[PDB]
Amino acid sequence: SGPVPSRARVYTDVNTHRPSEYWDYESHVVEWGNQDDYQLVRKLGRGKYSEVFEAINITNNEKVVVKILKPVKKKKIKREIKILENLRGGPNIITLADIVKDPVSRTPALVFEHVNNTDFKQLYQTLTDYDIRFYMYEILKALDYCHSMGIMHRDVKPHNVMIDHEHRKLRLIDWGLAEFYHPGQEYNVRVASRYFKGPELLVDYQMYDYSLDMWSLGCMLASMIFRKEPFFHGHDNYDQLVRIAKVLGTEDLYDYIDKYNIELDPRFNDILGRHSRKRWERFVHSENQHLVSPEALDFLDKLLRYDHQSRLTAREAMEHPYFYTVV
Amino acid sequence: PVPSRARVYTDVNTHRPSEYWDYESHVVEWGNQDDYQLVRKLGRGKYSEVFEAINITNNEKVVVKILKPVKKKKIKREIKILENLRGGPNIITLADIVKDPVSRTPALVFEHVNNTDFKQLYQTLTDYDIRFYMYEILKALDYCHSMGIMHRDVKPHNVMIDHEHRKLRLIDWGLAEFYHPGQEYNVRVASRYFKGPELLVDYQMYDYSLDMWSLGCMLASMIFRKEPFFHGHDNYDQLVRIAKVLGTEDLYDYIDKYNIELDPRFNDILGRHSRKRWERFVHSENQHLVSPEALDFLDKLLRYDHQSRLTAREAMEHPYFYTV
Numbered sequence A: 001s002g003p004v005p006s007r008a009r010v011y012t013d014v015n016t017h018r019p020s021e022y023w024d025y026e027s028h029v030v031e032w033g034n035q036d037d038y039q040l041v042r043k044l045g046r047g048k049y050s051e052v053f054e055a056i057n058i059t060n061n062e063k064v065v066v067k068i069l070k071p072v073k074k075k076k077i078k079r080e081i082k083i084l085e086n087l088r089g090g091p092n093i094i095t096l097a098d099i100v101k102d103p104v105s106r107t108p109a110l111v112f113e114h115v116n117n118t119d120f121k122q123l124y125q126t127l128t129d130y131d132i133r134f135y136m137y138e139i140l141k142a143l144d145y146c147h148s149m150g151i152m153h154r155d156v157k158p159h160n161v162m163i164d165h166e167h168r169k170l171r172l173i174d175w176g177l178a179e180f181y182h183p184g185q186e187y188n189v190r191v192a193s194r195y196f197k198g199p200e201l202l203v204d205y206q207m208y209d210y211s212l213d214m215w216s217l218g219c220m221l222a223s224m225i226f227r228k229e230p231f232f233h234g235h236d237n238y239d240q241l242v243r244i245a246k247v248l249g250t251e252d253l254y255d256y257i258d259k260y261n262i263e264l265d266p267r268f269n270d271i272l273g274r275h276s277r278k279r280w281e282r283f284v285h286s287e288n289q290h291l292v293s294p295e296a297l298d299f300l301d302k303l304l305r306y307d308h309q310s311r312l313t314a315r316e317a318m319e320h321p322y323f324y325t326v327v
Numbered sequence B: 001p002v003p004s005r006a007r008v009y010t011d012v013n014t015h016r017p018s019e020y021w022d023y024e025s026h027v028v029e030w031g032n033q034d035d036y037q038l039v040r041k042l043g044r045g046k047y048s049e050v051f052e053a054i055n056i057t058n059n060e061k062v063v064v065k066i067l068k069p070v071k072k073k074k075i076k077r078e079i080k081i082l083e084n085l086r087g088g089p090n091i092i093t094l095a096d097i098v099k100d101p102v103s104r105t106p107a108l109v110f111e112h113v114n115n116t117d118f119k120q121l122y123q124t125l126t127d128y129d130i131r132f133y134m135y136e137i138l139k140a141l142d143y144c145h146s147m148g149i150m151h152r153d154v155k156p157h158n159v160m161i162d163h164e165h166r167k168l169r170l171i172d173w174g175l176a177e178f179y180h181p182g183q184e185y186n187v188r189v190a191s192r193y194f195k196g197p198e199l200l201v202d203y204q205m206y207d208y209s210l211d212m213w214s215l216g217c218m219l220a221s222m223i224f225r226k227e228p229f230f231h232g233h234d235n236y237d238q239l240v241r242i243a244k245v246l247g248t249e250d251l252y253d254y255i256d257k258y259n260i261e262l263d264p265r266f267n268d269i270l271g272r273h274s275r276k277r278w279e280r281f282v283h284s285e286n287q288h289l290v291s292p293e294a295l296d297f298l299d300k301l302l303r304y305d306h307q308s309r310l311t312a313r314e315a316m317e318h319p320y321f322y323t324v
C-alpha cells in the first residue's frame, strides 16, 4: 500500500486557512528596483548559486548586505522572495530591505539589514553554559515564528546563523531552501546539509514537516555542548544514517521505519550493522564538562529522536527547564 | 528668535545613551497576529482604527490598533516611546507588536480599558471627581516628562476613564516626541482647541510646558461647562479666541520677549482686547465646580509665556489638590 501518512502536531492547517496569495509563490509579482543606489564594498561569502557582499546605500550612507543570485531556477528565486516578504520584521529573521537588479547585468539581487558577524573561531573557546542557553533560545524564537507562519526553513546549521556577540544579536539567514507546509504534501528529500539531515530525509520519507528543523537544531546543540564538530560525521548520505545509528542504536531505527511502513533502500544492507543505544553521558569529557548538565542532556534527548512526531516542537522546547535561567 | 529651554527635566535625555532616544535606529520585532481574534470596531482615527479583540492563548480581552503606514519613521517613534514608558503610572500598556500574515499591516496590542461615556460623565461629576482625575493625569505627565517625553496631543479624546474602578489611562502617543534642549520642533501638532500659543505663532523651540497649556484648556472646559473653552475655526482664528480672554497686551509682551515675527495673516483679524477676570465665566449651571483654589490654579496654567506656566510637579503641590 506504500508509506503511512503523517502531519505536523502544531500549525497543521495555517496555510490551508489562508488565501492562495500567501502561499502561491509562482503567481507572485516581483518588482525589481535599480541597484545604482547601492555600492558594493567587499565579498563576505560565496555559496552555491549565490555570492554575499557588504555594501553601502548611497542615499543614507548606511551599510547593507547584498546577495547576488545565479538565476539557475526562476521558480526558486520567487519562492525565497515570497517567504522573505511574508516573514519581514519577524523576531531574529534576516530583514529583506530591497529587491534590485543592476541595469547592465540584470542579475537578481536581494538587499538585507546589516549584521556585524563576530568570528566564532575564537568565541567557542570563551563560551559559557549561559551563552549557549541564551543563543539557543534566540534560535527557538525565530523557529516558532516561521513555523507559526507555515514555513519550514529546511537548512538549519551554524553557517546560516549570524551572531553579533558584542550586541547579543542573532539572525537566521539563507531562506533559499525554505518551503510552505501543506498537510499531506510530499516534499523533495534533497534538502539541508549532510551533517544536519534528519532521519526522514535519509530513509526517503517525503511527508515531513517543521519537525525537520528541530532535528537540525539538536545536531547544533550536541556539537556545541560536547565540542565535537560535526556531531554526526557522515561521508555520504547513506553513511550519515549509520553515524546516527552508532549513537541512537538500530533497535529504535527499525521501530521508526515500521511505524511509517518505510521501505529501507538496499544500499543500507552491508553498512548498517547492529548498534546499541548509547547513554548521552558517554560524550562528556574534561574539555566539555563545563557546558554539560542533567537539564542539557534531557533537552538534547527530546530533540534527537528518529520519530519526527516525538521530537519537541519549538514552543514545547521554549518551556524546557534548560531555559529556566534565561529572560 | 530668542532661545528657550525647559525649567524641569532639561537634560534627562542628554545623560542617557543614544539607544534610549534614537528611535530611527530601533529594531522592531513584528509578531504573528494569528494569536488575536478581532471582535468589534471601537473607533476610527486619522491613519488608525481601534478594535476590541481576544488573545486566543489566555482568553483575555485586548485593544488592537491598526495603523495606516503613511510614515514608517512615525511608527518607530510611537513604538520606542511606548516601550520606554511601558508600566508607568496611568500610561496605556503596550502588550504586543504584531502583523497579519496576509495584509502585513502594522498593529499595536494594548491592555484592555472599559471606558465610561464622556458625554454621560459631564452631568453627575462633582468638584472632588474633577480634583481626583486631574491629579491622575498629572501623575502620567510628571512621569512621561521625567522620562524626557512630551505627549503633544493632550485632550479629552486621549484620556480613557473607567469610573466604576476609578482607573485613568493617557493614550495615543503617536504625536509624542523626545525633548532635547535647543531643538526646533514641528509646530503642526495637537488638536486645534488645545494648541498652545507657541504653536500658533510658529515658535519652534518649545518643551513639556506645551502639555500644561492643553491640560489648562481641559480644566477650563470642565469647571465652566464650556466645550471647547477656546473655540477657534482655523489655526489663525484660534490665537484670536485666546486673545479675547488673555488680552492683546500680554500677547505682544510674549512676542517681543522671544523676538517672534507675527505672520501677516493676523493683521486684519487680531484686533485689540482686554484681559478678562476668570470669575466672569461662573454661572448657575457651573458654580458647584468653581472655587477660589480652582481659579488660581487655572490662571497659573493658561499663560502665553510657556516658561511662566506651572510644571506638572509644581501643579501637584497646588492647594486645589489638598483634598486628594
Ligand SMILES: CCc1ccccc1-c1ccc(CNCCc2nc3cccc([N+](=O)O)c3[nH]2)cc1Cl
Binding pocket: A044, A045, A052, A117, A120, A124, A132, A135, A136, A158, A159, A160, A161, A162, A163, A220, A221, A223, A224
Ligand atoms: C555552532 C552551533 C551552535 C550551537 C549552539 C549555540 C550556538 C551555535 C553557533 C551558532 C552560530 C555561530 C556563528 N555562525 C556564523 C556563520 C556565518 N558567518 C558569516 C559571516 C559572513 C557571511 C556568512 N554567510 O553565510 O554569508 C556567514 N555565516 C556559531 C555558533 Cl557556535
Ligand SMILES: CCc1ccccc1-c1ccc(CNCCc2nc3cccc([N+](=O)O)c3[nH]2)cc1Cl
Binding pocket: B042, B043, B050, B115, B117, B118, B121, B125, B129, B130, B133, B134, B156, B157, B158, B159, B160, B161, B218, B219, B221, B222
Ligand atoms: C473628569 C475628568 C476630566 C477633567 C477635566 C477635563 C476633562 C475630563 C475628562 C472627561 C471625559 C473623559 C473621557 N474621554 C474619553 C475619550 C475616549 N473614549 C474612547 C472609547 C474608545 C476608544 C477611544 N480611543 O480614542 O481610542 C476613546 N477615547 C476624559 C477626561 Cl480626562
